[PDB]
Design a protein around this ligand. Structure first.
Ligand SMILES: Nc1ncnc2c1ncn2[C@@H]1O[C@H](COP(=O)(O)OP(=O)(O)OP(=O)(O)O)[C@@H](O)[C@H]1O
Ligand SMILES: Nc1ncnc2c1ncn2[C@@H]1O[C@H](COP(=O)(O)OP(=O)(O)OP(=O)(O)O)[C@@H](O)[C@H]1O
Ligand SMILES: [Mg+2]
Ligand SMILES: [Mg+2]
Ligand SMILES: [Mg+2]
Lengths: 356, 359
């Protein structure tokens, strides 16, 4: 019998079968209804006759009717399974309210009649996918970024840091600067183009100052991109100014700490006796950590903040866009996990509170 | 902390269980005086006043004196540990003679007085490093290439294929063909240069017909390399011709079939009911699998050879140069492995024969 793994992203659902090395289904977490309903790419394609909503905002489910349609679509149309036949592992964001985890549980057992389920914190699964149970994850996704330090398999909630900036902000920022360069990217189709430029051409500079100087004195950092209208746009410093925002949130008018500071602060909130292990096990996950150079830059920044003898290591797996999903797939596949599933029988006896 | 030591024909990879990479990587060479012993790079630096010796030829320990010096240097000079304080995992080749393993465990207990040790097959550790216990491994290293099908943790000796050709043989051939086009590569220090070129510019072309026909009518494949003597050369079609040898060994006057065929054939020597699992879990490891494009090229050749609907997957991890060592580091770190070491006590109550039953 096959378990399902569903990572409920703000932007993209990743779904599939435990034991597979990648999610079978990856699709927009959007539900469209006429101005019954559509989900995912079909909703987006038919946007001109639908009202589109995003039931997950900074990783928290905020519209349960629409979330039910995402999950229905996931089981029946993407995976082509009957959920009553499969143990189902779901993910949640760090700091997810208790009542939310209970509602997810109630829906899974009473609406979808799953035989068993489990809910895990996204960043914890990413740590597992890197082969670790102790470490600190930076998970940067669509609309939010978290640091989650983890000890012997469990997140340490008191030390979690949340930064209200992630990939969508970086896309908006690049849209703004390319607009000012004299192109128009405002609409939804044109937003997708900018997102694509960001994902293909952007990188994190090891030394932002030096890189700005290099961009000012030669064309060595330029790359070009053909837009759908046939115009070819060339960018230079835009490539690294855009993700520099992660380190300097002032670039988009935010007073927040950057991701290097939230990482350090999160480690410093943890027990002094585990910090050596945290510093040596910083794992990066989520789409907004995909920038070339991000790991070397974090290494440099954390080294400047940490005690001078401290061993610092940043792990940025090639698969880190899907590491949350992968961690779920590994976990749900282990013979030692099979006693940890919450069963329908247990739910019938104890109600939604069992999930904690 | 346990130690892991992968005894390579060309390179020793050594370090601490739990690390994600070996601390020490050095040549498997022991120089005595020509007319008092040195190992690794210092033997290479003193090669002029020392007889160099390679104690490991195609993965099989051949000269136990020299191997003792390799291990002695590994503990005391490279890792700077006292062997008596660490359980020690060694690797061995596929089909290591049974007596070979023993003498390996004797030396470990009697000369270095390790508290515990274990001996694992290199290809099997590479499978573990990919997170699997079922798959077929292609391990191409310095002195040998090997296919080892593995099922539920058990390597399958009957289906193993041993291609007598690897990294040294591609290094040797690249010196032969480079000096033909114009340049000059024949000597010991010029050998270190062409193995540098091998590891930086060589690649496996997807269609060998289309890329040899591309080079002779278009300069799109040329790259420029800086010599230590202080100059610039340009290597063209021999980037991909060098490692093409792996898929068709007739290039160096050698009879037996390529790595794509030894891979197919290894699968066919296995039980028909597991071939499914082998085809979809083909793991590549060892320095000589590092060529870019080798996974795509292997993928092409075996989908053509295997049944049309068979699901086929080549796994070539970016870390595959040290996959054997990494698999050891994983294994020796597992709490579930700790009961499985052979202790100094068990060795003193049974003999060297305990390595056959406990490993
Ligand atoms: N190669 C890449 N380089 C830079 N950004 C990328 C890359 N690939 C994807 N992204 C960005 O990652 C973001 C989406 O991240 P991700 O899929 O991890 O979020 P999610 O899991 O859907 O949402 P959540 O924030 O709820 O975890 C988008 O902004 C997207 O543009
Ligand atoms: N990046 C590279 N590209 C191609 N070949 C490489 C690369 N790096 C190393 N090699 C080659 O791989 C060989 C060494 O690999 P490896 O450490 O796996 O052999 P070994 O384990 O020492 O020997 P063996 O397992 O055959 O007994 C050398 O010939 C080396 O030149
Ligand atoms: Mg996410
Ligand atoms: Mg327009
Ligand atoms: Mg080897």
């Amino acid at each position: 019998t096959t378990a399902l793994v569903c990572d409920n992203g703000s932007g993209l659902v990743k779904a599939g079968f435990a034991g597979d090395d990648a999610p079978r289904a990856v699709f927009p977490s959007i539900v469209g209804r006429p101005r019954d309903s559509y989900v995912g790419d079909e909703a987006q394609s038919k946007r001109g006759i639908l009202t589109l909503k995003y039931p997950i905002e900074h990783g928290i489910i905020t519209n349960w009717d629409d979330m039910e349609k995402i999950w229905h679509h996931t089981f029946y149309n993407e995976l082509r399974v009957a959920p009553e036949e499969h143990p189902t592992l779901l993910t949640e964001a760090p700091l997810n309210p208790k009542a939310n985890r209970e509602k997810m549980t109630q829906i899974m057992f009473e609406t979808f009649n799953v035989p068993a389920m489990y809910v895990a914190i996204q960043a914890v699964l990413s740590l597992y996918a890197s082969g670790r149970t102790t470490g600190i994850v930076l998970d940067s996704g669509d609309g939010v970024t978290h640091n989650v330090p983890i000890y012997e398999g469990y997140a340490l909630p008191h030390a979690i840091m949340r930064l209200d900036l992630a990939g969508r902000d970086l896309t908006d920022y690049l849209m703004k600067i390319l607009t000012e360069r004299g192109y128009s990217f405002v609409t939804t189709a044109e937003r997708e183009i900018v997102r694509d430029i960001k994902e293909k051409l952007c990188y994190v500079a090891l030394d932002f100052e030096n890189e700005m100087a290099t961009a000012a004195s030669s064309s060595s950092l330029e790359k070009s991109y053909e837009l759908p209208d046939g115009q070819v746009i060339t960018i230079g410093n835009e490539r690294f100014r855009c993700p520099e925002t992660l380190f300097q949130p002032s670039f988009i008018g935010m007073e927040s700490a950057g991701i290097h500071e939230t990482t350090y602060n999160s480690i410093m909130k943890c027990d002094i006796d585990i910090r050596k292990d945290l510093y040596a096990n910083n794992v990066m996950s989520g789409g907004t950590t995909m920038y070339p150079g991000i790991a070397d830059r974090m290494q440099k920044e954390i080294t400047a903040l940490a005690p001078s003898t401290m061993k610092i290591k940043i792990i940025a797996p090639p698969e880190r866009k899907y590491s949350v999903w992968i961690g779920g797939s590994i976990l749900a596949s282990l013979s030692t996990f099979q006693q940890m599933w919450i069963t329908k029988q247990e739910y019938d006896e104890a109600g939604p509170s069992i999930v904690h």
